[PDB]
Amino acid sequence: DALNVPSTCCFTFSSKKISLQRLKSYVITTSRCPQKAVIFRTKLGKEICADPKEKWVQNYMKHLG
Amino acid sequence: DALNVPSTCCFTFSSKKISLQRLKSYVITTSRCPQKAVIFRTKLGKEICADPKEKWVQNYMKHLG
Numbered sequence: 001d002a003l004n005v006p007s008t009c010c011f012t013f014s015s016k017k018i019s020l021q022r023l024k025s026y027v028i029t030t031s032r033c034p035q036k037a038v039i040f041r042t043k044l045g046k047e048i049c050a051d052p053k054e055k056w057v058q059n060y061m062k063h064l065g
Numbered sequence: 066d067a068l069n070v071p072s073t074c075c076f077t078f079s080s081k082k083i084s085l086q087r088l089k090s091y092v093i094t095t096s097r098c099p100q101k102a103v104i105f106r107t108k109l110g111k112e113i114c115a116d117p118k119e120k121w122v123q124n125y126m127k128h129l130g
Binding site for chain 2: 001002003004005006007008009010011012013014015016018029030032033034037039046047048049
């Protein structure tokens with residue numbers, strides 16, 4: 001027996017294209033989420049939901065690695 | 066246009082009944098999540114997923130409020 005903890009999912013995608021300079025990293029949401037999403041983490045710690053299909057999101061993922 | 070941020074959901078429920086003394090508060094997950102869950106927040110800041118069908122879970126919610 002163990003404690004289990006929550007998962008992070010995106011159900012809406014950001015409509016603002018944030019400056020790439022604010023960003024530290026990205027992750028793709030757990031496969032358990034109903035929809036695939038990118039979560040960007042900013043250098044100040046904010047998490048931003050973004051649509052994996054959008055050109056800007058893809059370009060940012062390429063820059064971030 | 067605005068940034069949007071992630072949601073917190075539970076996909077598995079804790080099997081350990083945690084001590085009530087460890088707990089600070091609870092919330093029910095957003096209706097955007099694909100299943101209903103309780104998240105307990107411990108006094109030290111940990112978030113724990115729990116099944117609202119379970120008797121102890123409902124008892125704990127009563128005590129916390």
